Design a protein around this ligand. Sequence first.
Ligand code: HEM
Ligand code: HEM
Lengths: 399, 399
Amino acid sequence: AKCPVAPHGWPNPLLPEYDQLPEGRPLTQVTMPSGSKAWLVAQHDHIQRLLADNRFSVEPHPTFPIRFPAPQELLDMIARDAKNLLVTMDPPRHTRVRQMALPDFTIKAAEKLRPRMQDLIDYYLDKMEAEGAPADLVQALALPFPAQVICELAGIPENDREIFTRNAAIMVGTRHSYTMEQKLAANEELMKYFAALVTEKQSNPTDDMLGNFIARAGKTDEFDHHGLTLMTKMLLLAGYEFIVNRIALGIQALVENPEQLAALRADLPGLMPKTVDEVLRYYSLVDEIIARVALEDVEIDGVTIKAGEGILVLKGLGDRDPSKYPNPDVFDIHRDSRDHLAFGYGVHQCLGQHVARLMLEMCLTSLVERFPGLHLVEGDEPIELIDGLPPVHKLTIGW
Amino acid sequence: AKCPVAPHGWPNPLLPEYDQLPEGRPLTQVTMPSGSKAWLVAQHDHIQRLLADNRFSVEPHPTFPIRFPAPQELLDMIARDAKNLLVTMDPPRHTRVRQMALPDFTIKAAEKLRPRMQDLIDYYLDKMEAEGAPADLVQALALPFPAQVICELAGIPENDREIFTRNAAIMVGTRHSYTMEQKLAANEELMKYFAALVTEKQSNPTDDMLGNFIARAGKTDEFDHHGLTLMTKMLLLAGYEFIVNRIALGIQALVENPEQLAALRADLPGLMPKTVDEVLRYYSLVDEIIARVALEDVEIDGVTIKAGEGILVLKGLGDRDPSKYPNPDVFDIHRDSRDHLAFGYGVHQCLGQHVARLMLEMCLTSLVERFPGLHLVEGDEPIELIDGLPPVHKLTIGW
Ligand code: HEM
Ligand code: HEM
């Protein structure tokens, strides 16, 4: 019947880890390239219980689970900067640093962004509608719109935006869109820009997410300038790839399920929150693993995760867990998916989740309201495959 | 009870082409890296109808479907030696060259090998039982036994068989067993050995498969010495990786289905033929694509495959075709699998198929009989993963 598969047009294979579990997806111990041990965690309940457990850590550790062999020199450089990234800090330092940004990421603070966000969307759909009737939604909305929202978060003036848009789009593209050279260079330019932006917030403070974070951090001795630059990068780019893919894949799911799209448009107030939840849950399959290391022995359902052993949270499979979501591999906006794992769980659960939800909701609502004839379209020429895969993500649509 | 998935322990992902088809797996046109066009062919009926058609070609062609981007010089290299490989010859020449080896590959010819094969199997199985109950069937039998059979086919004397065996193992191992530098080393070692074996049979003829073919070839002007060397590599090594893995995959399938193992042991004469068929059919999924280019337009279903265009036959999906095999993704020795596609179809259908069938049958019969307690030794120890995959082919059994 229905199976976990990569979405149509997806330019990556699914994570091979998904194929490494017995039937029933029990906790499965594996040996990492370094000889360290980790556990594959794919059950929705196990993921929540383990990611809420204070005995697991995100910080560098001699047996932290690392999935590929890599030169230890640059392992060491990454581990040295982990203290400057919120996602690799444990509590209680994690708690204090997260609180420096948190007031600008609440539901109500995100909501304050809605009028500007609608202007951005209205802009992109005006442009899409004014040009040719067949459009690539990845290029027309999914890539550029969140970049602009990030600039609003960072108080970046409009003159500077078009060039951060350039480098952000390079970071997030496939290997067939931008070289390993153009990327590590666009990274360098972003890091230069982020350092100059931090400096600019320290003089002349501003009332935006980044400005208020920099200000709150300055009242402590928690970061030097290099640490504020890494935090700035994380706060602005940690979610870019995710939200880009969720916008395109969400619209793809709706046009691939026209009966649900028809029902959604008839009842936007009642079905849009569920639609957002279902796009979040269903496309966790194409998201990355969430990794931790145990600091103490952890017992769960008759298995012992020993201190120093990793857990590899197969987040996408947890959101396809049949005991939590009946017929889990069917996309269905009517299901109960409120408890999804797309944002993770526990203390590191996505700081940007309310900004992210609003971006996804507002994009889906606007395309659905504005294009009652919205449908999937084949395109000029047959699908390109390189090594059997689509080289870039695109979604060709008509209306 | 469905979902085509990689077998447990398989060190590669499934072919990404498998994921590029619409529901129903219709004939699906794609654009290759070079810009040429090809068709994805996954329906059992279509595969037979297209591979039967003499309008398709295996010979170099400006728009032959090539799945990866490639230097033209290395295309050139492959192209100028396609005259020397049966697998890249079209009829009429393909028919005449194949006749030079066919007599030693018939059902009757293969059956002549059964006495020697049984002594080979008994040797490896003695050595395995003696060496201790937890054994890796890949090392113990699946790799070396078919290498020996090839030695018997080529008339390779016993004093050379240890080196030939380890070199064959090198070329079929994953990138983690052996290096690409370590592999090309064994390639030219084997190509030197094959060119010396050609010379030896030209001066001291023999009645083995390879000797007969060299003699029959010498009665014509078809090959120079380099040609006979290439042909010798193909006739000896074309199926080695396939039969190695089928032996191991077949034992895994039987143990993973104890009720079918039990019925096989109770009725070996009636059920072993069907077991071989189903091991061939079911594991086509992990075999390679079959490719052709059209030399004229070919109409099928509703589609016209135009003269410049390729077909990429998704042989393994064809053997999972639901309209040909009910519940196709269930391994079931009791089903009708006689029409399977594992050996291909049409003029190029596997030359070694009868030797391959006998090797597989004899191995399964001897293992199943000799070790009543036969089971898999897995689930208790951590599996090694590199980049999320089993690093090497391995099948740990016990009895
Ligand atoms: C659909 C969109 C998004 C998804 C699916 C997503 C997913 C996630 C996940 C799974 C985590 C937890 C990783 C872990 O526990 O190791 C996380 C953390 C985080 N996300 Fe997002 N994210 C999204 C959008 C965003 C956006 C738009 C932003 C910022 C503008 C953002 C900022 C962050 C930050 C700063 C963290 C670190 C939180 C911490 O360590 O306390 N994310 N995200
Ligand atoms: C389970 C075992 C095997 C499988 C699944 C298999 C599969 C195949 C397939 C699918 C083809 C056709 C390729 C195409 O049409 O492009 C083929 C051809 C061929 N096979 Fe096998 N093979 C196996 C064993 C062997 C063995 C043991 C040998 C040699 C002793 C062998 C030698 C050949 C040769 C020489 C060809 C080329 C025939 C031609 O082009 O006319 N194969 N095989």
